[PDB]
Design a protein around this ligand. Sequence first.
Ligand code: HEM
Length: 292
Amino acid sequence: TLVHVASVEKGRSYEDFQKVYNAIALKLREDDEYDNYIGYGPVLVRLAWHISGTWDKHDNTGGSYGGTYRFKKEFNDPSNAGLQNGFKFLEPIHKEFPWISSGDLFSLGGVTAVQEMQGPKIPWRCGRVDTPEDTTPDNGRLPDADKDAGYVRTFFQRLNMNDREVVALMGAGALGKTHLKNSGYEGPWGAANNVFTNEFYLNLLNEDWKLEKNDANNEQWDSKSGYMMLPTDYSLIQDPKYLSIVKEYANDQDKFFKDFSKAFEKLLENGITFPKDAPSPFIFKTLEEQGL
Ligand code: HEM
């Protein structure tokens, strides 16, 4: 019940993908003004998560492999509202490197953004293959934000993620912000929202949060510091098992970076079979490491 074998883009190797990395990274640098100077890093790692998070372990439908976000049904998923911005960013890159598959580009965009925003290295594998429009999953596989801990735990079981993987993933460097017109929630999780940090965990623990209603008539937790947490975020300190992992990552930056790197790669790779003869995962160099 549904197999997807990774097939390396013909004749490509590490250096080819580093070149795509760099063009993405260079474009991140250049289009700095987007979203009141947040830049496109956060929306790129949200795009990578949403294209991967449609996966279902039961029948291997959804997932990053087929690059199906390029079809209207998924592009138009209300859950993906705002991600068009990320797709538009990547269009010039796809045009310069037409040989890369859509799944590989969406997922490599997420890796690139995380690394350029000073996050951990994320090992990445190529070989996703575009699949037809009829393989696009239905809307409704991404998680709601108005729910509690039990919802979150059950939701992520479908993505084969456990408690520790779920808390590392959500804490997601503390990046970008909620926008009322996209999601019915408004504001950032922290102060350094285009730098990958463990500040989400710190803020959850140390801020003084009040449950308020936003202009869209949705509840969210708000802080005097100007920060916000989704009901689902806040549930990570309401559930005692989540809570001890929140404290752990708030008190160990390196541990969080390593756990996140593992789970993000895992997330991006769910549903994909890699041949024994596949190339090993690539670790890309940042622009800064290349002196670029
Ligand atoms: C229970 C799971 C989660 C829920 C309910 C969810 C929900 C949300 C919501 C409502 C937004 C705001 C969208 C908008 O208004 O622009 C948001 C932002 C985003 N999400 Fe999540 N999220 C979850 C998991 C994740 C995880 C696992 C990642 C990736 C590792 C992630 C990365 C992001 C990013 C980076 C943003 C900011 C995008 C922007 O600034 O443009 N989310 N998400």
